[PDB]
């Protein structure tokens, strides 16, 4: 009918079994699907705009797009070891560099 | 987990609903209680069939679910969580779809298939029983995929029959033989 | 009579077996459809619609499998079942396609009765290896003195004829086929060509004139005409090069040579566009498909010369791309240029100028250089290339009205005579024996003593002169295919005896 | 020559309409019941050949 | 069929219906939706699955209530053909627009046809003359030929076509069809008037013409199937009677154009340049249902309206493949005071050869092209410099080319009033002599206004006297 | 990740989607192998689409594919073979020879996804290549460690050019070359194979001095693409472990580009300006960045490029112009006039043109050559329009020096004993600088233009004078 | 819209609704998709020019790019006779003054 990222099988089977968000689907995230180096992560409803997030593949990302369900991450490193179901910790510090 | 994915449109739900009940260890009950409730929603006097397209609030919808779970107190707590998901996504135009989809998954786990043996006009009862015997002898019905023969009447069958089950058909209809006979004699 | 034909057909029809697949039609219309089901379906396989249509299948989905109809869509209804034939698409190949037209699928449409079948083949066979290939050395001509002379036409190479629609695009190809009479007659089959002409996007009347042309000039007896007219389905236009290539390949296997004309690939592309967008999958550049390159490149690398552990065959290819109000940088035109090894560019303006067959020598290139011109013909056209390339700079300066020295005007005077020599009449075969004398005259400066208007008068007369007197000169050229010391002198004397008129 | 070639065509559509005319008589009869039954017993033999 | 349904949607002229019975529908069927317009006749073009069909709508879409009853006719629409269609104008569904009431017939046939085969093909190589000098010499037509015209309209297309009718249908006299796809209504009346006056349409007898008119006012769908309707009539003539016909169309670009509008709606994703992906299949069928058969042959004259007067667009470009001869007409040359405005360097025929319309014809025609082309190449030079700053050999060509250019005109006999010069008609035989003459230098030594708005060589001489006094 | 079983769901040509069982999927950039009646079909994983659905690019011919046909996972990426024994041997997308030598003799294997070397490892190029081609040596010097670029349009003698460089330099050096062909014809592959076995460069006894990677256009657009990657990895083994400088070649690199554009569209991605990929920049970069001078060894590419219609407002050639140090243009025109090579040297710019790299003397001679020729090209319009007006003795002398130089750019080649039949000559770097110096000074402004025609050094001009005298 | 403009019959009073739709071209170029769509439907142009406008005819008419081709069945005999071939004549002056300079 229509496409949503709450009609994904992992999301639906956890809600039906009465599992909640639990700061894992609210702050942190988990990858739903990543392709074209554009990971889309489920959770992170508390997040700032273009905030730095750290994956379990070693790769870091930015959030150009904050959409309702997903937060559409763009990955800065290679895709080689990046995959589905990763925890994507919220670094909680917007992208920054040393000044001095 | 799914007992293989079947149905792309609204089979995504049916898959969830099924994988959640496999860990409960009662899928059959779930299906049964949902089935009886699915009917009693449909046969609601005013606003059975007449409200299926949402034009209200997600919150007004949530209260449509709430009033439904009063109609029967046996529905299981997992199909109660399915309703929430449906109320919140605001879908009720393919509500009975999930229920049927769930039946197809469910009754494959039972080892029943629901076949049809469409004809021009009803065949004999000895014909039916001979066809079910015949299918069981063959490998088209392997067991665990056991048709229940439902005769349906189709005016575009000009004689003969077409037998149906799974993705397997044996077609000795007259409509096909005449269509082909005609074409060559005008080719 | 009629009673008997119809009764045989009833005997010849009906009685289908137990089916092992099904699926129900849903979407349907445009020559195109989509079915629900089908788990044994192969990609490219043929599925039999119960209306009398057959449709190959190019997209499979776990939803809805897209089987593109061949047959008329008006026959097809929804909710029908379809039955997998269980064989990917194939054509009968045999020596019974000689002097007959066959369509997309390989059945005759000219009513000349059933074909003779010695094999079946498949439309996808693809290119042979690096080890079963050898290099091309194999002389061949097109019966246009200009083309032969300037660019190295071979047997086993691919040369792309490009330029505007309806400038006698077809006509250029027809001159070559007429001239392919000369080798076919010759006893040896290691010379013979059994030419296959593929016509895509053309009206039935175009094809029907062309077969009359071929028979009249007594050239229809090795030719095969494959057709897919513009009304006939988008799959069948797509299948027309690939099944022509399988017909061509059978000669190759046997150790005989043949030549494949793909007129026009541009219209094949247009069909595939219609097909790809009605399976609603993304195209490439300018609405043309994303896998359009895959189609031209795979096809084209199958017309290949073979080594001596094989037949030692070679199918030769001539692509034709008609550019719609020009444009050489348009997506289908760009792709094909890259795939081909030479261009025989045809220029529209020069046609009105009276330079028919029209060619432009800079837009026509050879990357690897000359290696397939007849050795005799190489010797005479030796400075022909340098003159004409120079004439183009000099001429442009020359007509302005400025002042010129005698040195610049030797180029103008020399070029004008050379260009006029190139002119020939379409649908006129030519031989090496009668292109060697003419280029000698031109290069060695005996066409400057002869006025510009009467260079055409001169040609026909010079070759006639030789039939009576220096008939020995012509024979040496035919027989030895090269010019030695003696032949240069003989010919230098032959030009001198008749320079007049 | 042209009339003979039309006449061959006219023969072919005229005898086509007799096949249809004959089909209507079969779909009138209780052969419409009796031959559907023949199909029916043939399908038992077919599924048995598997 | 007794298949009934209700109207789910009514999106523009592309109504969608949903059948409540399980009896399944077929492609190229017709449905009638009972309307306060009497009835509306529609044509299934797609089945989208689930018994939801998608239908093309011919007449208006004001009044169609949603969930309104249908009955399914069960097949294609059949128009009425015969010799009792002669002197009648018929609408797409058949209706009289000239109101001599219901159209009589012996045969009523489906609109669509299945294009002839390779087997049914026959050939031609005949010479047909319009009598127009530029057309005859450079682009000669033939009997059973398919001709193509190009460049915009409201610039002399109507007149040009009217003139082609005025010559060819009175040099023939047999059966003829006029089919006008997206015709301009005020002009259509001038054809009706013009024909009756010129003795063509005769309604106290029967005409030597039959007619189809579809106006450009009408919904896209009707405009698409004006053309198919027309072709059914021409095939009747070609086949049943056994006689060769004529066909004129002004303009056939409309077939293309209307199909482009409906395409987006139908489900189809349209190609770049906004043209339907189905142009090829529609073109293919039309141009092979006008074709030289074993029976008759429909000699046709086709007028294409070109947008921005560009051939680089795919709709005009894909047509050239199916045309034996073209005579490309460009608006600028029409402006210059030259009629016919046909370009002489942008004309072609597959019947202009050195033994098809004879050798003399070829030599003359060749020379004109060579002369004019050189002149075209030098147009920059001639204007930036002068015309004695040119090289001498060229000075002769340039001067020669200028005479030919003014010469090309031939006042029309149907627009004689509007040019302000009487209509001139000259033979193919008279034309070969006249061009030959100019090339010989016979009456080259006389003003450029002398060759200005006159037909053949003879008229030129008569006018030198007029300027001289 | 680990070997698992998935079933095909959708076949959309090259594009193949799989639906692996729940919680089990391969990671991105892996190789799946699927049993097929035509070799072993290799599928390159390029996306995840959720619920364990991957979408792949084909590496081997597609035909006869059933939805439901088992797909194994290797557990890792497409792994090629590398070694000092794969030199002469032919390798393609799936590392199999197509001249039927059977399974490759492998010392080591490696992945084709090798992440680029970092800035710490970098070294500054100071080693100077000689090509022994005068017009190239003088007007756009190459340096070994470079990223040379053979810009040209269609049919301009690029293959013939590459054929001379490989024939001469590979044997000369004690290094290696690996010749990689991306999406090019089976006529060319068979010529490139035949001519280079003959000359002694590729030889079956002994270790070949140039390896071959033939990837050809009959193969898939995906399969064609990652041929280039395949060649690179062999050069990388040479660079690193064997510790040897490489003299790389790739041919034609637009074929590489074109392939990525096509597959961008099929994957569903939105195309950029003038029908080019949005991922155009990074893909060129990945290959170019790997080819670089490290304290491991160098890798020196010489890359043919196809430039549609001698046009460079087209974005795909223009982006590529950045990456390449010492450009040359093989103009179509130069070839036709009978001048070999086809290089036009007023459109070639090099960054390797200093004045203490190649010495002061080199730079300065070429500068005068640039000006001398270009004033002559500038006077062509002037004769064209004005006639014999607005000239001088100074112009006449420049016109004359330039036409002597113009016909002094031609150097016959051994691998064109098949095009014109004129055999090779080799001209040293120091030798070209001297011979060009002599002409400029006007000591050889007394020797006719055609007496610089098909010469090498200075000795050759004097000798070609005697021929014309005699 | 345009073909609603119509001179009707005497059954209908002989009425009119004369259309005069005014198109604004980009940059004085008469070949673009919108100008050409309007041009096919209508007959003639009353093409207007900016150079002539500045130069004392407000508003200005360009008669080399303006015709009316069904115009002379609407006119009276006076304005037919007096004006006969005058339309040509100022396009003969066009030919002359092109090569006069």
From Swiss-Prot, chain B:
Q: What else is known?
A: Present with 32400 molecules/cell in log phase SD medium.
What PROSITE patterns does the entry give?
A: ATPASE_DELTA
Subunit (UniProt)? F-type ATPases have 2 components, CF(1) - the catalytic core - and CF(0) - the membrane proton channel. CF(1) has five subunits: alpha(3), beta(3), gamma(1), delta(1), epsilon(1). CF(0) has three main subunits: a, b and c.
**Name of the gene this protein is made from:** ATP5
Question: What functional role does this protein have?
Answer: Mitochondrial membrane ATP synthase (F(1)F(0) ATP synthase or Complex V) produces ATP from ADP in the presence of a proton gradient across the membrane which is generated by electron transport complexes of the respiratory chain. F-type ATPases consist of two structural domains, F(1) - containing the extramembraneous catalytic core and F(0) - containing the membrane proton channel, linked together by a central stalk and a peripheral stalk. During catalysis, ATP synthesis in the catalytic domain of F(1) is coupled via a rotary mechanism of the central stalk subunits to proton translocation.
From which source organism is this entry? Answer: Saccharomyces cerevisiae (strain ATCC 204508 / S288c)
Similarity annotation: Belongs to the ATPase delta chain family.
Q: Where in the cell is it found?
A: Mitochondrion; Mitochondrion inner membrane
Extract one GO BP annotation from the record: proton motive force-driven mitochondrial ATP synthesis
Question: Superkingdom, according to UniProt?
Answer: Eukaryota
Note the InterPro entries from the entry. ATP_synth_OSCP/delta_N_sf (IPR026015), ATPase_OSCP/d_CS (IPR020781), ATPase_OSCP/dsu (IPR000711)
> What is the designated name of this protein?
ATP synthase subunit 5, mitochondrial
HAMAP family assigned: ATP_synth_delta_bact
Any keyword Mitochondrion?
Answer: yes
UniProtKB/Swiss-Prot annotation, chain C:
In UniProt terms, what is the effect of altering residue 340 to I? Answer: In ATP1-1; growth-defect
Q: Which residues form a coiled coil?
A: none
Biological processes per GO annotation: proton motive force-driven ATP synthesis
Question: What is the predominant subcellular site recorded for this chain?
Answer: mitochondrion
Where is ATP annotated to bind?
Answer: 163-170
Residue numbers for the site described as Required for activity?
Answer: 364
Which Gene Ontology cellular-component terms appear in the entry? cytosol; mitochondrial inner membrane; mitochondrial intermembrane space; mitochondrial nucleoid; mitochondrion; proton-transporting ATP synthase complex
Q: Which GO-annotated molecular functions does the record name?
A: ADP binding; ATP binding; proton-transporting ATP synthase activity, rotational mechanism
The entry assigns this protein to a family as follows:
Belongs to the ATPase alpha/beta chains family.
Protein role? Mitochondrial membrane ATP synthase (F(1)F(0) ATP synthase or Complex V) produces ATP from ADP in the presence of a proton gradient across the membrane which is generated by electron transport complexes of the respiratory chain. F-type ATPases consist of two structural domains, F(1) - containing the extramembraneous catalytic core, and F(0) - containing the membrane proton channel, linked together by a central stalk and a peripheral stalk. During catalysis, ATP synthesis in the catalytic domain of F(1) is coupled via a rotary mechanism of the central stalk subunits to proton translocation.
Supply the HAMAP family for this chain: ATP_synth_alpha_bact
**Binding partners and assembly:** F-type ATPases have 2 components, CF(1) - the catalytic core - and CF(0) - the membrane proton channel. CF(1) has five subunits: alpha(3), beta(3), gamma(1), delta(1), epsilon(1). CF(0) has three main subunits: a, b and c.
Swiss-Prot record, chain D:
**What are the cysteine partners in each disulfide bond?**
none
- What is the source species? Saccharomyces cerevisiae (strain ATCC 204508 / S288c)
Question: What is this protein's function?
Answer: Mitochondrial membrane ATP synthase (F(1)F(0) ATP synthase or Complex V) produces ATP from ADP in the presence of a proton gradient across the membrane which is generated by electron transport complexes of the respiratory chain. F-type ATPases consist of two structural domains, F(1) - containing the extramembraneous catalytic core, and F(0) - containing the membrane proton channel, linked together by a central stalk and a peripheral stalk. During catalysis, ATP synthesis in the catalytic domain of F(1) is coupled via a rotary mechanism of the central stalk subunits to proton translocation.
Subunit structure, briefly?
F-type ATPases have 2 components, CF(1) - the catalytic core - and CF(0) - the membrane proton channel. In yeast, the dimeric form of ATP synthase consists of 17 polypeptides: alpha, beta, gamma, delta, epsilon, 4 (B), 5 (OSCP), 6 (A), 8, 9 (C), d, E (Tim11), f, g, h, i/j and k.
Name of the coding gene: ATP4
Family recorded in the similarity comment: Belongs to the eukaryotic ATPase B chain family.
Q: Where in the cell is it found?
A: Mitochondrion; Mitochondrion inner membrane
The name under which this protein is listed is: ATP synthase subunit 4, mitochondrial
Q: What else is known?
A: Present with 12900 molecules/cell in log phase SD medium.
Residues annotated as transmembrane: none
Swiss-Prot record, chain E:
Q: What does this protein do?
A: Mitochondrial membrane ATP synthase (F(1)F(0) ATP synthase or Complex V) produces ATP from ADP in the presence of a proton gradient across the membrane which is generated by electron transport complexes of the respiratory chain. F-type ATPases consist of two structural domains, F(1) - containing the extramembraneous catalytic core, and F(0) - containing the membrane proton channel, linked together by a central stalk and a peripheral stalk. During catalysis, ATP synthesis in the catalytic domain of F(1) is coupled via a rotary mechanism of the central stalk subunits to proton translocation.
Provide the Gene Ontology terms for cellular component: cytosol; mitochondrial inner membrane; mitochondrial intermembrane space; mitochondrion; proton-transporting ATP synthase complex
Q: Where in the cell is it found?
A: Mitochondrion; Mitochondrion inner membrane
SMART domains on file: AAA (SM00382)
Please list the residues that bind ATP. Answer: 151-158
Give additional notes from the record: Present with 164000 molecules/cell in log phase SD medium.
Q: Which gene encodes it?
A: ATP2
One matching Pfam family: ATP-synt_ab_N
Question: Which InterPro entries does the UniProt entry name for this protein?
Answer: AAA+_ATPase, ATP-synt_VA_C, ATP_synth_F1_bsu, ATPase_a/bsu_AS, ATPase_alpha/beta_chains, ATPase_F1/V1/A1_a/bsu_N, ATPase_F1/V1/A1_a/bsu_N_sf, ATPase_F1/V1/A1_a/bsu_nucl-bd
What are its E.C. numbers? 7.1.2.2
The record's catalysed reaction(s) read:
ATP + H2O + 4 H(+)(in) = ADP + phosphate + 5 H(+)(out)
**Residue numbers of Phosphoserine PTMs:** 334
Q: Which Gene3D superfamilies match?
A: 2.40.10.170, Bovine Mitochondrial F1-atpase, Atp Synthase Beta Chain, Chain D, domain 3, P-loop containing nucleotide triphosphate hydrolases
Q: Which domain of life is it from?
A: Eukaryota
């Amino acid at each position: 009918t229509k496409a949503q990222p709450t009609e994904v099988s992992s999301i639906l089977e956890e809600r039906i079994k009465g599992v909640s968000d639990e700061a894992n689907l609210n702050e942190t995230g988990r990858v739903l699907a990543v392709g074209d180096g554009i990971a889309r992560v489920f959770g992170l409803n508390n997040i700032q705009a273009e905030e730095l997030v750290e994956f379990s593949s070693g790769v870091k990302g930015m959030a150009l797009n904050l959409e309702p369900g997903q937060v559409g991450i763009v990955l800065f490193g290679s895709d080689r070891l990046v995959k589905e179901g990763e925890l994507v910790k919220r670094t909680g510090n917007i992208v920054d560099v040393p000044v001095g | 987990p799914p007992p293989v994915r079947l149905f792309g449109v609204e089979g995504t739900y049916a898959t969830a609903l099924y994988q959640a009940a496999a860990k409960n260890s009662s899928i059959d009950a779930a299906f049964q209680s949902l089935q009886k409730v699915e009917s009693t929603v449909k046969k609601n006097p005013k606003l059975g069939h007449l409200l299926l397209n949402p034009a209200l609030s997600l919150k007004d919808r949530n209260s449509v679910i709430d009033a439904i779970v009063e109609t029967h107190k046996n529905l299981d707590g997992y199909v109660v969580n399915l309703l929430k998901v449906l109320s919140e996504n605001n879908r009720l135009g393919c509500f009975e779809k999930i229920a049927s989809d769930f039946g197809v998954l469910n009754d494959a786990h039972n080892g029943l298939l629901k076949g049809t043996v469409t004809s021009a006009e009803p065949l004999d009862p000895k014909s039916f029983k001979r066809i079910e015997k015949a299918l069981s002898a063959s490998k088209l019905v392997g067991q665990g995929k056991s048709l229940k023969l439902e005769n349906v009447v189709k005016p575009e069958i000009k004689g003969g029959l077409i037998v149906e089950l799974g993705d397997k058909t044996v077609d000795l209809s007259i409509s096909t033989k005449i269509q082909k006979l005609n074409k060559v004699l005008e080719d | 009579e009629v009673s008997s034909i119809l009764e045989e057909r009833i005997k010849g029809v009906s009685d289908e077996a137990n089916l092992n697949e099904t699926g129900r039609v849903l979407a349907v219309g445009d020559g195109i459809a989509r079915v629900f089901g089908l788990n044994n379906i192969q990609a490219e396989e043929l599925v039999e619609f119960s209306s009398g249509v057959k449709g190959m299948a190019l997209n499979l989905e776990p939803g809805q499998v897209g089987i593109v109809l061949f047959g008329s869509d008006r026959l097809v209804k929804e909710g029908e079942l379809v039955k997998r034939t269980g064989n990917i698409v194939d054509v009968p190949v045999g020596p019974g396609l000689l002097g007959r037209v066959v369509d997309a699928l390989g059945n005759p449409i000219d009513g000349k009765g059933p074909i003779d079948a010695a094999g079946r083949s498949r439309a996808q066979v693809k290119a042979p290896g690096i080890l079963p290939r050898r290099s091309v050395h194999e002389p061949v001509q097109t019966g246009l003195k200009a083309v032969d002379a300037l660019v190295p036409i071979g047997r086993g190479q691919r040369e792309l004829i490009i330029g505007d629609r309806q400038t006698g695009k077809t006509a250029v190809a027809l001159d070559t086929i007429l001239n392919q009479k000369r080798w076919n007659n010759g006893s040896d089959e290691s010379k013979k060509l059994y030419c296959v002409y593929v016509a895509v996007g053309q009206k039935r009347s175009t094809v029907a004139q062309l077969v009359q042309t071929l028979e009249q000039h007594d050239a229809m007896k090795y030719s095969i005409i494959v057709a897919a007219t513009a009304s006939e389905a988008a799959p069948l236009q797509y299948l027309a090069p690939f099944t022509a290539a399988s017909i061509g390949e059978w000669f190759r296997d046997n150790g005989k040579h043949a030549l494949i004309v793909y007129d026009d690939l541009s219209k094949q592309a247009v069909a595939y566009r219609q097909l790809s967008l009605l399976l609603r999958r993304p195209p490439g550049r300018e609405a043309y498909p994303g896998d359009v390159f895959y189609l031209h490149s795979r096809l084209l690398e199958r017309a290949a010369k073979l080594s001596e552990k094989e037949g030692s065959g070679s199918l030769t290819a001539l692509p034709v791309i008609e550019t719609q109000g020009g444009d050489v940088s348009a997506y289908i035109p760009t792709n094909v240029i890259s795939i081909t090894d030479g261009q025989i560019f045809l220029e529209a303006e020069l046609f009105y100028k009276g330079i028919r067959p029209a060619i432009n020598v800079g837009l026509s290139v050879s990357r690897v250089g000359s290696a397939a011109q007849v050795k005799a013909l190489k010797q005479v056209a030796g400075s022909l290339k340098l003159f004409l390339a120079q004439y183009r700079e000099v001429a442009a300066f020359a007509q302005f009205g400025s002042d010129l020295d005698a040195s610049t005007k030797q180029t103008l005077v020399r070029g004008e005579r050379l260009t006029q020599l190139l002119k020939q009449n379409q649908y006129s075969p030519l031989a090496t024996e009668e292109q060697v004398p003419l280029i000698y005259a031109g290069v060695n400066g005996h066409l400057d003593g002869i006025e510009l208007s009467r260079i055409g008068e001169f040609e026909s007369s010079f070759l006639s002169y030789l039939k009576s007197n220096h008939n020995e000169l012509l024979t040496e050229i035919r027989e030895k295919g090269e010019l030695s010391k003696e032949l240069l002198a003989s010919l230098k004397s032959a030009t001198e005896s008749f320079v007049a008129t | 020559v042209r009339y003979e070639a039309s006449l061959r065509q006219l023969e072919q559509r005229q005898l086509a309409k007799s096949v249809i005319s004959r089909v209507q008589s079969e779909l009138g009869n209780p052969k419409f019941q009796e031959k559907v039954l023949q199909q029916s017993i043939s399908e038992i033999e077919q599924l048995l050949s598997k | 069929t007794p298949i009934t349904g209700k109207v789910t949607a009514v999106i523009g002229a592309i109504v969608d219906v949903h059948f409540e019975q399980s009896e399944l529908p077929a492609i190229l069927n017709a449905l009638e939706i009972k309307t306060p317009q009497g009835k509306l006749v529609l044509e299934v073009a797609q089945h989208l699955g689930e018994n939801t069909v998608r239908t093309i709508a011919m007449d208006g879409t004001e009044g169609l209530v949603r969930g309104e009853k249908v009955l399914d006719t069960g097949g294609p629409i059949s128009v009425p053909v015969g010799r009792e269609t002669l002197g009648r104008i018929i609408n797409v569904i058949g209706e009289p627009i000239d109101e001599r009431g219901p159209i009589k017939s012996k045969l009523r046939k489906p609109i669509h046809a299945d294009p002839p085969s390779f087997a049914e093909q026959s050939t031609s190589a005949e010479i047909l003359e319009t009598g127009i000098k530029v057309v005859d010499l450079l682009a000669p037509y033939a009997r059973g030929g398919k001709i193509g015209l190009f460049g915009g309209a409201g610039v002399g297309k109507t007149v040009f076509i009217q003139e082609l009718i005025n010559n060819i249908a009175k040099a023939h006299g047999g059966f003829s069809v006029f089919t006008g796809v997206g015709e301009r209504t005020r002009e259509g009346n001038d054809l009706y008037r013009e024909m009756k006056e010129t003795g063509v349409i005769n309604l106290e007898g029967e005409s030597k013409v039959a007619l189809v008119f579809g106006q450009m006012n009408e919904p896209p769908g009707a405009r698409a199937r004006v053309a198919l309707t027309g072709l059914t009539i021409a095939e009747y003539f070609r086949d049943e009677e056994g006689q060769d016909v004529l066909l004129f169309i002004d303009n056939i670009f409309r077939f293309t154009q209307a199909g482009s509008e409906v395409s987006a709606l139908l489900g189809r994703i349209p190609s770049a340049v906004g043209y339907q992906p189905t142009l090829a299949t529609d073109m293919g069928l039309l141009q092979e249902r006008i074709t030289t058969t074993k029976k008759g042959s429909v000699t046709s004259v086709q007028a294409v309206y070109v947008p921005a007067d560009d051939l680089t667009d795919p709709a005009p470009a894909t047509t050239f493949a199916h045309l034996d001869a073209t005579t490309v007409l460009s608006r600028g040359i029409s402006e210059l005071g030259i009629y016919p405005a046909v370009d002489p360097l942008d004309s072609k025929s597959r019947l202009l050869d050195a033994a098809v319309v004879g050798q003399e014809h070829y030599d003359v025609a060749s020379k004109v092209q060579e002369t004019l082309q050189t002149y075209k190449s030098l147009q920059d030079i001639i204007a930036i410099l002068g015309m004695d700053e040119l090289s001498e050999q060229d000075k002769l060509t340039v001067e020669r080319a200028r005479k030919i250019q003014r010469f090309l005109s031939q006042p029309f006999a149907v627009a004689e009033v509007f040019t302000g010069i009487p209509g001139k008609l000259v033979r193919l035989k008279d034309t070969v002599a006249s061009f030959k003459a100019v090339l010989e230098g016979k009456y080259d030594n006389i003003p450029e206004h002398a060759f200005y708005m006159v037909g053949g060589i003879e008229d030129v001489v008569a006018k030198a006297e007029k300027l001289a006094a």
